[PDB]
Design a protein around this nucleic acid. Structure first.
Ligand SMILES: [Mg+2]
Ligand SMILES: [Mg+2]
Ligand SMILES: [Mg+2]
Ligand SMILES: [Mg+2]
Ligand SMILES: [Mg+2]
Ligand SMILES: [Mg+2]
Ligand SMILES: [Mg+2]
Ligand SMILES: [Mg+2]
Ligand SMILES: [Mg+2]
Ligand SMILES: [Mg+2]
Ligand SMILES: [Mg+2]
Ligand SMILES: [Mg+2]
Ligand SMILES: [Mg+2]
Ligand SMILES: [Mg+2]
Ligand SMILES: [Mg+2]
Ligand SMILES: [Mg+2]
Ligand SMILES: [Mg+2]
Ligand SMILES: [Mg+2]
Ligand SMILES: [Mg+2]
Ligand SMILES: [Mg+2]
Ligand SMILES: [Mg+2]
Ligand SMILES: [Mg+2]
Ligand SMILES: [Mg+2]
Ligand SMILES: [Mg+2]
Ligand SMILES: [Mg+2]
Ligand SMILES: [Mg+2]
Ligand SMILES: [Mg+2]
Ligand SMILES: [Mg+2]
Ligand SMILES: [Mg+2]
Ligand SMILES: [Mg+2]
Ligand SMILES: [Mg+2]
Ligand SMILES: [Mg+2]
Ligand SMILES: [Mg+2]
Ligand SMILES: [Mg+2]
Ligand SMILES: [Mg+2]
Ligand SMILES: [Mg+2]
Ligand SMILES: [Mg+2]
Ligand SMILES: [Mg+2]
Ligand SMILES: [Mg+2]
Ligand SMILES: [Mg+2]
Ligand SMILES: [Mg+2]
Ligand SMILES: [Mg+2]
Ligand SMILES: [Mg+2]
Ligand SMILES: [Mg+2]
Ligand SMILES: [Mg+2]
Ligand SMILES: [Mg+2]
Ligand SMILES: [Mg+2]
Ligand SMILES: [Mg+2]
Ligand SMILES: [Mg+2]
Ligand SMILES: [Mg+2]
Ligand SMILES: [Mg+2]
Ligand SMILES: [Mg+2]
Ligand SMILES: [Mg+2]
Ligand SMILES: [Mg+2]
Ligand SMILES: [Mg+2]
Ligand SMILES: [Mg+2]
Ligand SMILES: [Mg+2]
Ligand SMILES: [Mg+2]
Ligand SMILES: [Mg+2]
Ligand SMILES: [Mg+2]
Ligand SMILES: [Mg+2]
Ligand SMILES: [Mg+2]
Ligand SMILES: [Mg+2]
Ligand SMILES: [Mg+2]
Ligand SMILES: [Mg+2]
Ligand SMILES: [Mg+2]
Ligand SMILES: [Mg+2]
Ligand SMILES: [Mg+2]
Ligand SMILES: [Mg+2]
Ligand SMILES: [Mg+2]
Ligand SMILES: [Mg+2]
Ligand SMILES: [Mg+2]
Ligand SMILES: [Mg+2]
Ligand SMILES: [Mg+2]
Ligand SMILES: [Mg+2]
Ligand SMILES: [Mg+2]
Ligand SMILES: [Mg+2]
Ligand SMILES: [Mg+2]
Ligand SMILES: [Mg+2]
Ligand SMILES: [Mg+2]
Ligand SMILES: [Mg+2]
Ligand SMILES: [Mg+2]
Ligand SMILES: [Mg+2]
Ligand SMILES: [Mg+2]
Ligand SMILES: [Mg+2]
Ligand SMILES: [Mg+2]
Ligand SMILES: [Mg+2]
Ligand SMILES: [Mg+2]
Ligand SMILES: [Mg+2]
Ligand SMILES: [Mg+2]
Ligand SMILES: [Mg+2]
Ligand SMILES: [Mg+2]
Ligand SMILES: [Mg+2]
Ligand SMILES: [Mg+2]
Ligand SMILES: [Mg+2]
Ligand SMILES: [Mg+2]
Ligand SMILES: [Mg+2]
Ligand SMILES: [Mg+2]
Length: 247
RNA sequence: ACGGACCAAGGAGUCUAGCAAAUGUGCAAGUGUAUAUGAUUCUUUAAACAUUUUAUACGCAUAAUUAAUGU
RNA sequence: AUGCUUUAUUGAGUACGAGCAUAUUUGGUAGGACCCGAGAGGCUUUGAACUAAGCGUGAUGAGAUUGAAGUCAGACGAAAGUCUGAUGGAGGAUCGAGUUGAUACUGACGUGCAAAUCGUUCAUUUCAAUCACGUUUAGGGGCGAAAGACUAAUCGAAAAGCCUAUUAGCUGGUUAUUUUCGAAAGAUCUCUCAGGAUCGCUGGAGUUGAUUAAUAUAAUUUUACCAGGUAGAGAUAAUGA
RNA sequence: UUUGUGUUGAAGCGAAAUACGUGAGUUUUCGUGGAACAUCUCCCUAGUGCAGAUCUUGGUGGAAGUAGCAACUAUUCAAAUGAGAACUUUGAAGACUGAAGUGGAGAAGGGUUUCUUGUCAACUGUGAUUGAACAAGAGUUAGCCGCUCCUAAGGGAUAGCUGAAAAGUGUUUAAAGGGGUCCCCGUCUCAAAAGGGAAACAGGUUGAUAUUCCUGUGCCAAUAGUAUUAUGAGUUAGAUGGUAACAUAUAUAUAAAUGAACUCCUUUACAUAGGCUUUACACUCGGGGUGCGUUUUCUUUGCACUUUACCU
RNA sequence: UUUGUUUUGUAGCAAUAGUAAUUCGUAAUUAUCCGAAGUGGUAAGGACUAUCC
RNA sequence: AGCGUACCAACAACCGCAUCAGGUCUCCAAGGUUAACAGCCUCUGGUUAAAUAGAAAAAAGUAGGUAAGGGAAGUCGGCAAAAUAGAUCCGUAACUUCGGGAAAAGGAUUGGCUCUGAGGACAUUAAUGUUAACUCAGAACUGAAACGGACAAGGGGAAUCCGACUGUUUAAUUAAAACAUAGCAUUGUGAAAAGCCACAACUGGUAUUAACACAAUGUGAUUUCUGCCCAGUGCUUUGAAUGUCAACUUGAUGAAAUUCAAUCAAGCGCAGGUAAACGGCGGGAGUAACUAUGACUCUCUUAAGGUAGCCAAAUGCCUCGUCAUCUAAUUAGUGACGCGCAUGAAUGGAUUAACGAGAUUCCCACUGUCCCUACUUGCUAUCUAGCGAAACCACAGCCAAGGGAACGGGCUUGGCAAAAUCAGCGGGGAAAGAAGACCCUGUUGAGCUUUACUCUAGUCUGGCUUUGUGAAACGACUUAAGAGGUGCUACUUUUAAAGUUGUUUUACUUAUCCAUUUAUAGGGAUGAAUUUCCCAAUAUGGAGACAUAGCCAGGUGGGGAGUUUGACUGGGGCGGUACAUCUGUUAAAUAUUAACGCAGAUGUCCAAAGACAAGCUCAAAGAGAACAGAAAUCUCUUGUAGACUAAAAGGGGAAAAGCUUGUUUGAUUUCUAUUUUCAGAACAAGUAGAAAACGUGAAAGCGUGGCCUAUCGAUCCUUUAUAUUUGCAAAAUGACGUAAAUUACUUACUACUGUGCAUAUAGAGGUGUCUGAAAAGUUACCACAGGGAUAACUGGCUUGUGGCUGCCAAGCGCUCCUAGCGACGUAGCUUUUUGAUCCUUCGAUGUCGGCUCUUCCUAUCAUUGGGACGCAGAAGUCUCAAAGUGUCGGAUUGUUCACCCGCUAAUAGGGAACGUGA
RNA sequence: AUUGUGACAGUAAUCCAACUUGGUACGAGAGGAUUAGUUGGUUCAGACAAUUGGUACAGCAAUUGGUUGACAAACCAGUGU
């Protein structure tokens, strides 16, 4: 047989990310003395667009505290921020949209985004456009905070980790029909080489488990086990259930 | 039924190991001078000549049979 | 126990030794093995000047048609709203040169101009558009809007050199004269039925005999003796009609 | 081993014989040839005897003076040269290409095919005096056109870590290297003759080069120390005008309006579609001047020329 | 510092160059190089409007 | 400063083997007509050359043009060609996703010349002057009624099938209904200990990412829908109640090696979920006031019994289904019907405007497709001067028949047969090209698949090491309180003490691992910014002896590797076993003898159905005896086997080989000579005997399985029996046994000597392909060596079947065998049907039908001349000589065949390699 | 060089209609021949061009675009139409 299409992606030759015009990685600010004792405030200079990403980025300027000079950050922007705005980051910053606070000082019900799942991590969890989380519970002895992730899962975090108040901007962009093949050609042109897609039952047996036959059918159960080797896991992977959902 | 338009040159049961039968030769209860060494051997000679100054190198034969101690 | 005894059975055993060395020929075995002949397998290297996909930097598409939202004006109407004229320039919109392709004649040619060309006809031109140079991906691997397609006239596994004079129960060939003898195409076993081993049929060596109109001998008769259930017959004898 | 032939002609080859043998073959004559050749007296030895294998290499036939020498509209008259002109040169005709040209200028690829002179053994599928064939000599000139410098998609390396090595990765805890006077910054190197980017124009000139040569007029970059003269400005440690938007150094030449560490910004620097508008090049009309053409008839007529670069 | 001009200059380069003509012996002269408008083919600049999961 | 600078850029300087009609990237761009850088003509610049020229000019070709009357009658099919086209002014249906359809369909006009009208700017005063530039309307005249005059330039309409649309594809035979697509649905994953994927290892891709994300599948716009089944196969969830399931570990025994036990791994099992997972979704019988039908009922039965829909559909064999319509005539088209061989719901069902170099039917226009051909132009062909190849070639080229390897140029017998040469042509040379690609064979391959055989990367699970420091709690070996029984003894029975060892559960930080940074302040209270108080004196943060890593062990594992997938055979395959055996016959009177010949049997059975002895006589019939009868049990007569003897068939058997009794284990251990098959090998199955111990009978005797002919198995390995026989490579193991003697290394004698293993001899565990390999499929993507030893055509022998012709006379014909016929039976002929066979061809004889063209036959349809009738005439029927002359136009189908509409004089049947593809 | 003989080989014509005979023969009626004659036609064969039609790069005329200054005369657009 021949190596399957999904196996070739791990070599990373024509399947690497398309990133010529991207603007940089979005991080929080590095944890230091100011955000551990008081707070520090930086000024929003511009909201810009990142070619591969749905959400927009804010360009925000802080003033160096250990030397004379200015410093730059790129941060996922929450819906409501404007150019000319001052935001404040630290353990003692007030509760307002756009500030960055430790999650252990937020009351129950607050909507947060751009969260650290470990302290000092510089933000990993809630980042896609239109997404938010919810603070659901606080530990009685401190030290622990409970949140509800966009997928619906519940997760307990260290209570010193940081997050931004508000929701990710540019929300609602999965409600417009794409409606044309060329529109999707332009969409993935700036992401990676994953489109269009030929389906397995239309191939020959050498190159897919679904190939061959005189009638274009699968011929074997399409739910495969978690333990199958690389060239064989191709249908529905370790599915607990199939068919239309009814609840 | 297949190969062959014509002419000249080339073109296919051999070599080595190991066994047997047949036949020629030498000696004969024996037979074969191994590897070496010797010599008034040294164009030929890489051939030929020699054998350690009641005489235990080795092979095959002179005795068979049995899993075997053995006989 | 220095085991004994006629027993019976077995040995490639014994009963006053024949062997060893050496030419040559022939037979069967291994080797390139009488000569020339695969489809394949393995080890190590070369190629993206063609073509496939991604990426960087640049360049290119005569002319014409249609007329979306927005805007100005006029007419109705109690409100809500509705009618007519112009302006405007949207769309994987329409026709069509060039460019990019290849529907039909199942046309020409088919010892071609050409190892895919020529003529007319046809599809396509603001977009999933076309071209150049640079750059990434290398063989059981790559690339594929998917035809087992393409990867230098080579792809249901590229090209180059070695292992290698690989192996073939199968096709083809196998070179001076005269003289003498002269077949088999049955049989047994066989992953055996286009093969092989074994018997039979043939040749060549050698000894023992006969050479005494004898004896041994004979695909022949005669004399003596033996065994048989086919042709014929029977159905009033058995069985079955 | 024996015993023989040859310049008074060996081997080989061609045609033969009142010749021998059942036969394969021996033997001899004449011609050509010009230097070696046998042994049958008996033995030894081998890469030792061809009609074929779509056998191997080389040479030669019938087919046969045959198939054929058909795209791209098309040729004619006279003269020169020459041994010899349908396809070399000159003049006169009739025509084609028709700016999306067999017109001009470059890239990839080629490497002297370029030029002048000579010249025809072979080639230029008919001819050939022609030619990109053959021979002998020549010809390519830059501060301003390019490369060279920058960085891109990317390639190769360093430290470390893997692996027997060959090789694979490329900061993954390097006392990394460099630069601003001791302190700061901080891996190296290559990859674009269409992307970024100091600076030039016109006329003339050769058989063959030209924004490169000649003539004239300009521009850009660089230029160390010491003095001396000259130009100009400023305080007698740094000038003025305007209410403002902002402006001012015109000396051969608008050259000078202080400003260290440290810090911020701008230019380089950027997609597509649609119409409106401006300037330059292009084309056209009517006057003036100059040359040419038609002219039985008509035509104050038909055609050509009437130009002006960078730089200040 | 105000006017039609006393007046020149193709603003300098620049006519000394180029082009089209007419003469003079086997290289020199001389004359011209100037008045008003249309069409929109190509190129570049300007101020704008629109499109993008 | 250094390096480049000539020339070509295709037209002969480049690549294509060449001076090849091919391929190959950028910039400049005039006049006329026009919307136009289109087409046609022209000025500047370039050229007048092409591997040749002259003459002639017929067949045939190739590229073109025209054609009276008809108008698709041609053909599989309107293939090719024709018709239409620019602008302006009118007029436009069904249907529809309201955007379209649309250039729908249709109608009228257009030259030239002479005129009229309408559209701007500027500067002096509603007046006056100076000046453009191209468009658009109207009118009169005019001409062989012509005018987008050349160039350029849509045919349209009514319907059916498929795909929604723009897009993509097999470079060089397939451009599509195939792929893609938006829309819809399902699955996995909260992260540097995560999902999917790469790598030998170290390390990487997605990732400059974070559920509105990345990854893996299916279906394929909109509209309206998406039924029932979790039994099977997959996937997935719970676990010490729970069976099975490794290493390690612990215990018991033993001199030890061993041996025997026990225990919370994952898997499977047990118990659930899931169909927009793979997939599935029934028969029989009766019944309503005429028939017919079956709302209704009864019955078998599944995990569930095909629901909404839809149909002789690109899906229906029968089939050219039945009805209607379209035509003159319809295997075609459309609309209906439905027990549908074998329709059906994201394997998507049913529809659908717009779109398409997609598949089909009809209508108008148009025409040389056709009736039915003719004429004409260029370039070839032709003759000449120059120049000048190749394929192919056993030898060569007239026929008829014969025989022959069954189709001859050569052989036999005949016909005949007279130099040399030019141009055409396609009957033959079973013509050329290529070691047949279909079929079979080979102990020759390869690609692909899987619940074929054997393995393997990856992945999941357990142990040991890496691996340090404290604590607690439950066990278990080591002690003390008992119901009982047992023959002192020998064993379970109640609650803390013993030292150690173990599960498990926590705490610590320094091993180990991860993250962030410029390793930049010890814990609490849309200007510029640089020369306080209290509390204590490993860069930081997060995990932590768990991960990770190394060795070993178990599960899963077509993702991957290697290999296999019998023989016979009226071709192979499917069937069967004729593959190891046995009875009768074919078998031709010794013996042997074939076929997928004929009628059958075998892989067993028996403590007696084996051995011996004695007594007895069987099947059946007749007569007779209470219930008793056709048959119960009793006597008597007759009785050559007509019974019985395990199982096929054949042979044998009467004081027995059969039945009934009595006693028994000869169905026992060892050895020879030999018969059957046959090589005169094995196995196996038999015959005659010898040595030993026994049974039976009074005894002579008989007995080594079954009255005779079938009833079965090598090497290697394993397993139990036998022995006064052996071994384990320098030696010993009963035993210092028995006698002496010591002052010890003393002397002599003996059949009998550790665990475990090996070995000799005998039986058993099995190979049925039976003289004995551990073995699944597919190839329509295909390879190689061969085969006319072997299939798919023509030809050859045969003639069952197919077709045609005879003989006899029951009966038909009102009557009457034979005008015309002829049942029950019988003899032939032909090779225009289909079979049977396998002789020729597999280093190749082109495989259906039509079109075209010639010739042959007669078994005569018409035309010529006759005979007979159940013959008035007319019209016909049977038959003789006879092959001279004819034997058509169309609708449907690829058709041969068939069927219908027509005309005719009649619309006969056949052959020539199933005549005829250079 | 003219005119001839002619062995042998090839060979060619075919079928139909109407009318008269005749509403006759025959027949109860209904119906209704043969044969011969006349005038035409189908298929085939061998020629031919007075008439009709087809054909055009003899010829004459008309005309679109372009080009010679105009008229006249012409030419190009592979045969412009
Ligand atoms: Mg496919
Ligand atoms: Mg597979
Ligand atoms: Mg499908
Ligand atoms: Mg052969
Ligand atoms: Mg041949
Ligand atoms: Mg030779
Ligand atoms: Mg000898
Ligand atoms: Mg060989
Ligand atoms: Mg192999
Ligand atoms: Mg390339
Ligand atoms: Mg590319
Ligand atoms: Mg379009
Ligand atoms: Mg073509
Ligand atoms: Mg063709
Ligand atoms: Mg396929
Ligand atoms: Mg070989
Ligand atoms: Mg003889
Ligand atoms: Mg053979
Ligand atoms: Mg007998
Ligand atoms: Mg008889
Ligand atoms: Mg000699
Ligand atoms: Mg000499
Ligand atoms: Mg030889
Ligand atoms: Mg030869
Ligand atoms: Mg010729
Ligand atoms: Mg020439
Ligand atoms: Mg032309
Ligand atoms: Mg021209
Ligand atoms: Mg043009
Ligand atoms: Mg030259
Ligand atoms: Mg020259
Ligand atoms: Mg020549
Ligand atoms: Mg030269
Ligand atoms: Mg420069
Ligand atoms: Mg880079
Ligand atoms: Mg560089
Ligand atoms: Mg540049
Ligand atoms: Mg030059
Ligand atoms: Mg130069
Ligand atoms: Mg040059
Ligand atoms: Mg080459
Ligand atoms: Mg060329
Ligand atoms: Mg040429
Ligand atoms: Mg012609
Ligand atoms: Mg005409
Ligand atoms: Mg006509
Ligand atoms: Mg028809
Ligand atoms: Mg027809
Ligand atoms: Mg057509
Ligand atoms: Mg329509
Ligand atoms: Mg489509
Ligand atoms: Mg399309
Ligand atoms: Mg193709
Ligand atoms: Mg095609
Ligand atoms: Mg599809
Ligand atoms: Mg999809
Ligand atoms: Mg659909
Ligand atoms: Mg289930
Ligand atoms: Mg378990
Ligand atoms: Mg199925
Ligand atoms: Mg139904
Ligand atoms: Mg239908
Ligand atoms: Mg029809
Ligand atoms: Mg079904
Ligand atoms: Mg369903
Ligand atoms: Mg289905
Ligand atoms: Mg010619
Ligand atoms: Mg030749
Ligand atoms: Mg013949
Ligand atoms: Mg022949
Ligand atoms: Mg003859
Ligand atoms: Mg022929
Ligand atoms: Mg073959
Ligand atoms: Mg072959
Ligand atoms: Mg294989
Ligand atoms: Mg496999
Ligand atoms: Mg077979
Ligand atoms: Mg006999
Ligand atoms: Mg008897
Ligand atoms: Mg008895
Ligand atoms: Mg018995
Ligand atoms: Mg066998
Ligand atoms: Mg056998
Ligand atoms: Mg296979
Ligand atoms: Mg045969
Ligand atoms: Mg017959
Ligand atoms: Mg042949
Ligand atoms: Mg052939
Ligand atoms: Mg043939
Ligand atoms: Mg008749
Ligand atoms: Mg008849
Ligand atoms: Mg035929
Ligand atoms: Mg026949
Ligand atoms: Mg053909
Ligand atoms: Mg045919
Ligand atoms: Mg033929
Ligand atoms: Mg006429
Ligand atoms: Mg005429």
């Amino acid at each position: 047989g021949r190596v399957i299409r999904g196996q070739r992606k791990g070599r990373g030759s024509i399947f690497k990310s398309h990133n010529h015009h991207r603007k940089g990685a979005a991080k929080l600010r590095h944890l230091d003395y100011c955000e551990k004792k008081g707070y520090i405030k930086g000024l929003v200079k511009d909201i810009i667009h990142d070619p591969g990403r749905g959400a927009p980025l804010a360009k925000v300027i802080f003033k160096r505290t250990e030397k004379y000079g200015k410093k730059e950050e790129l941060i996922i922007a929450s819906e409501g921020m404007f150019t000319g705005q001052y935001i404040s980051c630290g353990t003692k910053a007030p509760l307002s949209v756009g500030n960055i606070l430790p999650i252990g000082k937020m009351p129950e019900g607050t909507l947060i985004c751009n969260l650290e799942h470990r302290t000092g991590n510089r933000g990993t969890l809630v980042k896609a456009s239109g997404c938010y989380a919810t603070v659901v519970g606080q530990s009685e002895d401190g030290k622990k905070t409970k949140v509800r992730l966009p997928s619906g899962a519940k997760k307990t975090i260290d209570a010193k980790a940081r997050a931004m108040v508000g929701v990710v901007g540019a929300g609602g962009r999965i409600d417009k029909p794409i409606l044309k093949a060329g529109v999707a050609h332009h969409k993935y042109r700036v992401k990676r080489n994953c489109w269009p897609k030929v389906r397995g039952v239309a191939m020959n047996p050498v190159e897919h488990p679904h190939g061959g036959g005189n009638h274009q059918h699968i011929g074997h159960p399409s739910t495969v086990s978690r333990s199958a080797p690389a060239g064989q896991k191709v249908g529905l992977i370790a599915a607990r259930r199939t068919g239309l959902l009814r609840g």
